Design a binder for this molecule. Structure first.
Ligand SMILES: Nc1ncnc2c1ncn2[C@@H]1O[C@H](COP(=O)(O)OP(=O)(O)O)[C@@H](O)[C@H]1O
Ligand SMILES: Nc1ncnc2c1ncn2[C@@H]1O[C@H](COP(=O)(O)OP(=O)(O)O)[C@@H](O)[C@H]1O
Ligand SMILES: [Mg+2]
Ligand SMILES: [Mg+2]
Ligand SMILES: [Mg+2]
Ligand SMILES: [Mg+2]
Lengths: 154, 63, 77, 52, 300, 364, 536
């Protein structure tokens, strides 16, 4: 889990699979945004803050209990996720993202505006697993309804 | 010293045969965090040597 | 039989050869005794005593020991 | 220098026991600041007695 | 009480072989208290071991609170009683708006100065939002630049900066605070608490001391030694003792040492071998022979 | 090596330690509060104890080298053209905008300097700045025209020391630069060390809070380094006295008494450990032997005489180099804190015990 | 090697002491031949054919390539004496080496080095006290003759010694020219404000003392006049060039019509600045920055001089001498861009003088302050360089004499008197300090011995006669006038050096004694050397 103070065990998790980093949007085309006055600076600051709040609210509106991202996120998004009782994991690889989507029966959502309740996955138990005196953690997603994918832990 | 890829000019990425890259900043001059090396390419808040994340201080993608 | 290079080692070898020549027995006791004497002289020198004084004291003690050996000797047929 | 800790640090001793003595002098300097020469001599004398 | 006695015995047996056997009793009490302060958590990283050169090995101790090896700001107070901790992971250092494609493009330096004043006002408003929580101390994971430091000093608030991820996690565990990154909801963020914060003199380095902590589920063990090698070996021995104690806390089943377990297992193996025909009996006997060889080496 | 200068350095070191601590409360001394400055030239007799702050930086002004009743102020921002944290550019599309930019920059710098001057500040310290010009030519000219001493490139690590010394609160934005952030001082002068360099000394302060500076001078580099090391040793001795308030005699007296009493104790430890305790005592006998040997006396006779005198009943008896024999060492005022000897014994014994547990060497 | 196990060499005991004494003696013997009026200069080839001919000890020891640390100590001692006093650089090295040699001789006799160090310290303190109490002459009793004699003594042993009758007057006039007073009324003589220019050509007697300042620069453009009668000097610290916007300013053109106006203003800004400067009546304009061709044309049309790339220290000296003011920028406190006549310096003439196919600017008779400058003429560059070094020594000596108004007799008189007094006084202090002080007194005799040896004369009998004279002066209260008896190297006979005009500043002897004693103590304090092998 991204924030160390998040709960280590989630039951009946409604997983939301996302491939958009929880950061302010960025055009792919070479772009420059011009700030020409103090009002422009204030508008930009408010825009960033409202983008963070809006993305968190959009995630929370679907009723999800767990958010899985692929590209990571920054401090404000992490603390908002912790503050709204939304455990999350970041930097999940692409193959692992699609495996989670298959196992949990949830779709892969490329941006928050397209995230709905029907695209949410489901898992009976999502837990963080320790391995003794090694400070290494590994997330486990299991107890899915009709998981079409399996993993072997040796 | 092998790699001294000056970055976002607020930060400096430096590395050598030690094997642990170091993140410095110009103004303060304080080592922000030493990531547990010959290349220090940045994002074409993250860089690759193993991809590291500023926001978490850990390797995020290995290849 | 040893192939030594240090001069003091050669002195020890010649001491054993002398003991063998005059007596024929005790060729190992002399080396151990000399080593012990020099080992004690090491700390004596470290305490700040001129080595000539150490040698003179060793000679006096050796004279005393030889006299005592003559005293406690026993004769055989 | 006459300082024992500086003398020990400046010359690059190679034997592990000498390195430990250097660290001992450094620790004595840290805790007290004087006697950095006496402590090493005391340790050497203790080990010399340990020989016999 | 019997479990505490078992923890004592296990820590003593683990430390018997190592260099800490000189002060086995003191170090056993030290390690047992350090493990028990975790309140059943397995986080061995919550126990911080600080190695300070000089002093005797018996001078090592477990601080009743927590020790931080960071520094306080310039004009900020050096001592706070009944502290109200706020642990954060924010910028506090020329935090540019995260729209990387943005830039300032004007036609006069007066506009540039106005934008600079706007940036400074944004930092000031951020500091005011932080101070709205009603705090005395502020620990940030990242760096704090001169302007926020001056604002904190004028507010009479300690601003400990550059406390890394481990540092902020340990502070949150020991004081009960919440590692925040936004300050628009002061009522939704829990604040850490402790009776006293001050600076202590350990050897020749100055450290920040947290006393009378609230939760205390994080320990700082100070190691004093005569050489760096002694300090490293003491750290390794304490790591072994803490690991074994944590494992025993996780699983309380215990077996007797001093070769007793090896003798019992080897006796069972020999009993099995006496009932087995063929060369498998010889292999079993060799297995038991190795099991006996273990305490044989111990006695050797 | 600084023993003919002891009559100068020892009171200097005692005063330096006592200035930075509270005698009624302090249990330890932070030696970082006593800064030592090395300047080549002169002799060790030229060492001084500065009650104020000594800076090695050069005054950027010309002709303003002495300020009386100074009002020093620290600046952590830059006195140059405005430059936001974001990427900033100025776009010129008309010819009038050129001299408009010039005039507006001049007005901005002038406003900054006027705001600084209105507070009454006359000595300005500017923190070292990278990626931005801390001091501009316009800023320097304007400050010179208003009779303000300017010292730039102040290191970031010295801010705390300067603030504790002269009582200045650092200022990072011109908005908060007010009178109460200044630190008054009787004199701020840049002195000349007889052609061996220049030092800026700010002596006299309204609130001289627990900080002192020592200027070390010498003929060549080597004696200067050794003088600094010796002064540090003296400060550490006074720190030891501050920590544990116990004084013990010197000149080999503690080692002789320790060897005698440990031999007596070993005689009551019948068994196999008695030999080890005897060896311990004979090893502690070494320090007085070295003391006698270095003085040119006879080590054996001097050591045995000292041991006999200690056994007679007097414990403050040791090697007397001035007289050349054995005498009551307290008459020569050769004393040292007990902490030094206790720490020496404890650390040496721990190191020996650690070494005795090693029985193999493995090459990695 | 052995049980110590250190990767390097180690010398202990008498070996390292002898090595240190050998190194110090080598350094002393390098420069021993260049002491006193009968001394000789030296050639120093710089491995690529560069030749340096000098008699100054500091220059010789600085140009040499030394490796032994105990010898680097003496070289740095000479450099320190040069920096802090300016004279007696060879004497201090010689005295320190002799002190170290005699101290090691005592140590070899099982005298502890601490006793020798204590004796040396006591002897140095007593020698300083005796010099300050008995061997000083007040300059007010003599006048300008004392300064002239001190300068002439300074030029002795130098390439300009024979021409001392002229060079001493030149030095004294130059020093008195730059005299200024500060707060508390202490007169200060800021040497290094006398610019010294070297230009081969005519004989040494053709050296000129400029009543003003000499600039080693030329006018930017050939079109300007090369002589102004009533100069109005304006000093600038910025370049007079085409205006270019800084890094933070960018020119973006969307309407093509504005480009011509922008490019016009790009030079009109500098044109307006130059017009503002010239409108106040300035005739000579000196700037540390560059000047393009169009600005030079403006100055040509205005009929005014303009010198570019002027050194900053030269500009500061010009501003101080002429009463001008350095202006790094044209910006008043009203936010405008002005230049009023109050910043203009004045001079009675500015000339583009020609000196041996080279031209330089002569600013003559600056007002509001008198300045000085010296142009040295010689056979070649080596002569001019040695002249500059000797002239600097003379200026330093005159500065010391004018600041501290006490002088001492020269020619080894002080050394002999100190030797006699110290060997007499050693009988009262200590038992081994007696020997230490006696050896200090004997070591002080190396200066007259070297002076006598250099003159190819019997040193033994001359030093004996000098010692007898000083002993009679010390033991007979009625013959106290014999304290001034020194050495006359021309005839090899004792001579009253006070009436002979052979003087030195007291600070020279005092600082030489203190520095040499400290260096000898520092070297003598070593008894073991560890030389770690290089890592490569
Ligand atoms: N004047 C003196 N007379 C006799 N003994 C002295 C005198 N000064 C110092 N000592 C002794 O010399 C020993 C060594 O002190 P020193 O060399 O200054 O530092 P360190 O203890 O680090 O070697 C001390 O134990 C002290 O007792
Ligand atoms: N005219 C003179 N007659 C006799 N002795 C002189 C005369 N001029 C100088 N001396 C002596 O010669 C000594 C050597 O001076 P010198 O070597 O030229 O100075 P430095 O040591 O700076 O090179 C001086 O101590 C001085 O007393
Ligand atoms: Mg036999
Ligand atoms: Mg000491
Ligand atoms: Mg074990
Ligand atoms: Mg001279």
């Amino acid at each position: 889990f991204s924030h160390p103070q998040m709960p280590k065990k989630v039951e009946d998790a409604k997983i939301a699979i996302l491939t958009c980093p929880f950061e302010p949007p960025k055009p792919k085309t070479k772009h420059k945004l011009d700030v020409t006055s103090v009002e422009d600076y204030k508008a930009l600051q408010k825009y960033e803050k409202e983008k963070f709040e809006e993305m968190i609210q959009q995630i929370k509106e679907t009723g999800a209990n767990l958010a899985i991202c692929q590209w990571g996120f920054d401090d404000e998004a992490n603390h908002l996720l912790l503050q709204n009782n939304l455990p999350a994991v970041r930097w999940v690889g692409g193959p692992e993202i699609e495996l989670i989507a298959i196992a949990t029966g949830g779709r892969i959502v490329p941006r928050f505006s397209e995230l709905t309740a029907e695209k949410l996955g489901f898992a009976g138990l999502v837990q963080e697993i320790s391995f003794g005196t090694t400070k290494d953690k590994m997330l486990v997603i299991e107890q899915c309804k009709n998981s079409r994918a399996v993993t072997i832990f040796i | 010293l092998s790699a001294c890829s000056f970055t976002s000019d607020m930060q400096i990425l430096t590395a050598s045969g030690d094997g642990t890259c170091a993140l410095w900043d110009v103004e303060s001059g304080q080592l922000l965090q030493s990531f547990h090396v010959l290349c220090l390419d940045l994002a074409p808040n993250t860089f690759v040597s193993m991809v590291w994340d500023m926001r978490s201080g850990q390797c995020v993608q290995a290849f | 039989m040893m192939d030594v290079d240090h001069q003091i080692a050669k002195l020890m070898v010649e001491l054993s050869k002398s003991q063998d020549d005059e007596i024929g027995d005790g060729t190992t006791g002399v080396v151990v005794l000399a080593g012990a004497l020099l080992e004690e002289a090491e700390q004596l020198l470290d305490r700040g005593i001129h080595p000539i004084r150490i040698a003179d004291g060793y000679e006096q003690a050796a004279r005393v020991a030889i006299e005592h050996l003559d005293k406690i000797s026993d004769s055989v047929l | 220098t006459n300082d024992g800790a500086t003398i020990l640090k400046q010359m690059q001793v190679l034997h592990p026991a000498a390195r430990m003595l250097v660290e001992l002098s450094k620790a004595q300097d840290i805790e007290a600041g004087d006697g950095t020469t006496s402590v090493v001599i005391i340790a050497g004398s203790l080990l010399d007695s340990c020989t016999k | 009480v019997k479990f505490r006695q078992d923890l004592m015995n296990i820590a003593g047996t683990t430390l018997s072989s190592k260099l800490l056997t000189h002060h086995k009793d003191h170090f056993t009490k030290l390690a047992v208290e350090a493990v028990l302060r975790l309140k059943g958590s397995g986080n061995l990283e919550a126990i911080h071991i600080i190695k300070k050169l000089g002093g005797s090995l018996a001078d090592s101790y477990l601080d009743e609170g927590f020790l931080l090896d960071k520094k306080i700001g310039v004009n900020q107070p050096k001592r706070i009683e009944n502290a109200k901790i706020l642990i954060a992971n924010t910028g506090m250092d020329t935090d540019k708006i995260k729209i990387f494609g943005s830039r300032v493009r004007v036609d006069s330096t007066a506009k540039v100065a106005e934008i600079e004043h706007a940036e400074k006002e944004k930092m000031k408003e951020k500091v005011e939002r932080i101070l709205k929580h009603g705090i005395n101390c502020f620990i940030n994971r990242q760096l704090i630049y001169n302007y926020p430091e001056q604002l904190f000093g004028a507010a009479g608030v300690m601003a400990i900066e550059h406390a890394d991820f481990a540092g902020v996690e340990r502070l949150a565990l020991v004081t009960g605070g919440e590692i925040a990154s936004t300050f628009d909801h002061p009522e939704l963020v829990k604040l850490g608490s402790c009776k006293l914060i001050e600076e202590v003199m350990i050897g020749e380095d100055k450290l920040i001391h947290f006393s009378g902590v609230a939760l205390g589920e994080a320990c700082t063990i100070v190691l004093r030694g005569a050489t760096q090698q002694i300090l490293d070996e003491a750290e390794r021995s304490l790591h072994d003792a803490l690991c074994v104690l944590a494992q025993t806390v996780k699983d309380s089943r215990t077996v007797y040492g001093g070769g007793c377990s090896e003798m019992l297992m080897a006796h069972a193996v020999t009993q099995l071998a006496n009932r087995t025909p063929g060369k498998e009996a010889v292999a079993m006997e060799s297995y038991a022979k190795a099991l006996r060889m273990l305490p044989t080496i111990i006695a050797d | 090596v600084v023993s003919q200068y002891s009559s100068l350095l020892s009171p200097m070191s005692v005063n330096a330690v006592m200035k930075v601590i509270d005698p009624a409360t302090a249990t330890s001394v932070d030696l970082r509060d006593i800064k030592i400055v090395k300047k080549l030239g002169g002799t060790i007799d030229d060492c001084e104890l500065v009650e104020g702050l000594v800076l090695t930086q050069k005054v950027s002004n010309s002709g303003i080298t002495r300020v009386e009743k100074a009002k020093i102020g620290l600046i952590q921002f830059c006195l140059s053209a405005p430059k936001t944290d974001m990427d900033n550019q100025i776009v010129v599309s008309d010819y009038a905008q050129m001299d408009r930019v010039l005039r507006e920059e001049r007005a901005y710098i002038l406003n900054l300097v006027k705001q600084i001057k209105k507070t009454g500040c006359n000595v300005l310290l500017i923190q070292k700045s990278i990626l931005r010009d801390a001091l501009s030519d316009l800023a320097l000219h304007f400050l010179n025209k208003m009779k303000i001493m300017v010292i730039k490139d102040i290191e970031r690590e010295d801010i705390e020391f300067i603030c504790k010394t002269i009582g200045t609160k650092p200022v990072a934005h011109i908005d908060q630069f007010t009178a109460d952030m200044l630190g008054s001082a009787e004199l701020a002068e840049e002195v000349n060390l007889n052609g061996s360099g220049k030092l800026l000394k700010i002596t006299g302060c309204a609130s001289p809070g627990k900080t002192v500076t020592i200027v070390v001078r010498g003929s060549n580099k080597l004696v200067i380094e050794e003088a600094e090391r010796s002064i540090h040793d003296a400060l550490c001795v006074i720190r030891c006295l501050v920590k544990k308030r116990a004084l013990i005699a010197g000149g080999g007296a503690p080692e002789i008494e320790l060897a005698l009493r440990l031999t007596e104790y070993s005689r009551t430890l019948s068994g196999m450990e008695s030999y080890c305790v005897r060896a311990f005592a004979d090893a502690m006998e070494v320090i007085p032997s070295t003391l006698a040997e270095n003085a040119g006396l006879n080590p054996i006779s001097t050591v045995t005489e000292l041991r006999n005198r200690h056994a007679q009943g007097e414990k403050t008896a040791g090697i007397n180099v001035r007289k050349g024999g054995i005498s009551n060492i307290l008459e020569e005022l050769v004393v040292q804190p007990l902490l030094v000897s206790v720490s020496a014994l404890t650390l040496a014994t721990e190191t020996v015990r650690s070494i005795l547990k090693i029985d193999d060497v493995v090459n990695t | 090697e052995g049980p110590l196990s250190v990767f390097g060499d180690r010398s202990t005991g008498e070996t390292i002491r002898s090595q240190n004494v050998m190194a110090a003696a080598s350094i002393a013997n390098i420069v021993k031949s260049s002491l006193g009026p009968v001394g000789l200069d030296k050639m120093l080839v710089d491995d690529i054919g560069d030749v340096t001919i000098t008699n100054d000890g500091a220059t010789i020891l600085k140009l040499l390539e030394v490796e032994h640390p105990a010898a680097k100590v003496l070289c740095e001692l000479a450099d320190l004496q040069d920096k802090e006093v300016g004279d007696g650089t060879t004497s201090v090295v010689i005295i320190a080496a002799e002190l170290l040699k005699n101290a090691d001789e005592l140590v070899k006799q099982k005298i502890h080095p601490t006793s020798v160090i204590s004796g040396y310290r006591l002897a140095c303190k007593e020698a300083v006290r005796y010099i300050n109490e008995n061997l000083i002459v007040n300059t007010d009793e003599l006048g300008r003759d004392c300064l002239i004699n001190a300068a002439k003594t300074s030029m002795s042993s130098k390439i300009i010694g024979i021409n001392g009758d002229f060079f001493a007057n030149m030095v004294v006039d130059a020093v008195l020219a730059i005299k200024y007073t500060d707060i508390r009324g202490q007169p200060r003589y800021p040497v290094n404000s006398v610019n010294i220019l070297k230009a081969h050509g005519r004989s040494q007697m053709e050296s000129m003392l400029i009543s003003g300042y000499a600039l080693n620069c030329v006018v930017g453009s050939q079109g300007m006049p090369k002589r102004i009668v009533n100069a109005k000097i304006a000093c600038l610290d910025f370049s007079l060039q085409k205006t270019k916007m800084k890094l933070g300013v960018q020119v973006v053109i969307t309407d093509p019509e504005k480009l011509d106006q922008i490019r016009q203003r790009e030079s009109d800004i500098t044109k307006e600045r130059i017009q503002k400067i010239l409108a106040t009546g300035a005739n000579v304009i000196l700037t540390t920055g560059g000047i393009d061709d169009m600005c030079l044309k403006y100055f040509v049309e205005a009929g005014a001089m303009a010198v570019r790339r002027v050194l900053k220290r030269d500009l500061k000296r010009i501003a101080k001498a002429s009463g001008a003011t350095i202006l790094s920028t044209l910006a008043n406190l009203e936010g405008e861009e002005t230049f009023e006549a109050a910043m203009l310096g004045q001079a009675e003439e500015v000339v583009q003088e020609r000196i041996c196919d080279d031209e330089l600017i002569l600013i003559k008779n600056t007002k509001a302050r008198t300045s000085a400058s010296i142009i040295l003429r010689g056979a070649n560059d080596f002569m001019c360089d040695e002249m500059e070094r000797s002239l600097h020594d003379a200026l330093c000596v005159v500065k010391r004499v004018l600041e501290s108004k006490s002088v001492v007799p020269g020619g080894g008189a002080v050394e002999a008197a100190l030797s006699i007094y110290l060997e007499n006084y050693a009988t009262s202090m200590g038992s081994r300090e007696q020997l230490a002080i006696a050896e200090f007194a004997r070591s002080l005799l190396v200066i007259p011995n070297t002076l006598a040896v250099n003159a190819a004369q019997d040193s033994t009998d001359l030093v004996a006669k000098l010692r007898a004279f000083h002993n009679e002066a010390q033991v007979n209260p009625e013959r106290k006038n014999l304290k001034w008896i020194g050495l006359d190297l021309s005839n090899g006979k004792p001579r009253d050096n006070k009436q002979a005009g052979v003087f030195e500043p007291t600070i020279v002897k005092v600082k030489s004694l203190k520095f040499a004693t400290e260096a000898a103590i520092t070297i003598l304090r070593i008894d073991d050397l560890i030389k770690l092998h290089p890592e490569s």
